[PDB]
């Protein structure tokens, strides 16, 4: 194999995700102890907007 | 026209066809494909065939 090949070390994803047919990454989270899910999700949307 | 059609096919057609209540979606165009336009004269010059 050394006569017709070369070796390298790269980086690759061990598992790739897709959502609705497009590449995606899933993030699980929790709202603070004293905060509601709706406001936590609104904050997440606000952060993602940037 | 090719660029717009490819964008619609690769970024809009799949998600629209998967929308609730949508049946058949017809593309007024076509997605990109790697087109190899062969020259018969060049093929004959090098004794090659498709």
Q: Residue A40 contacts by C-beta under 8 Å, 6 or more apart in sequence?
A: A29, A30, A31, A32
Q: Is A14 on the interface with B (CB under 8 A)?
A: no
Kindly give the residue spans of alpha helices, DSSP state H, lying in chain B: 2-8, 14-17, 40-45
DSSP reduced 3-state for B20: coil
Q: From which experimental method does this structure derive?
A: cryo-EM
Burial class (CB in 10 A: 0-12, 13-18, 19+), A31: middle
On chain A, the residues whose CB falls within 8 A of the CB of B14 are: 21
Q: Is A29 on the interface with B (CB under 8 A)?
A: no
Gap between the Cα atoms of A22 and A18, Å rounded: 5
**Nearest-CA distance B11 → chain A (Å):** 9
Gap between the Cα atoms of B22 and B15, Å rounded: 10
Gap between the Cα atoms of B16 and B22, Å rounded: 7
């Amino acid at each position: 194999f050394s006569a017709f090949s070369s070796s390298r070390w790269e980086y690759g994803s061990p598992r790739l995700e897709r959502y609705n047919g497009l590449p995606s990454m899933e993030i699980l989270g929790q709202a603070a102890p004293g905060k509601s899910t709706g406001e936590a999700m609104e904050l997440m949307e606000q952060l993602a907007s940037k | 026209q090719e660029d717009i059609s490819d964008y619609v096919a690769a970024n809009m057609k799949d998600a629209i066809s998967r929308t609730s209540g949508v049946g058949d979606v017809q593309l007024f165009g076509s997605q990109y494909a790697m087109r190899i336009w062969m020259n018969p004269n060049e093929l004959n010059k090098f004794q090659l065939t498709p």
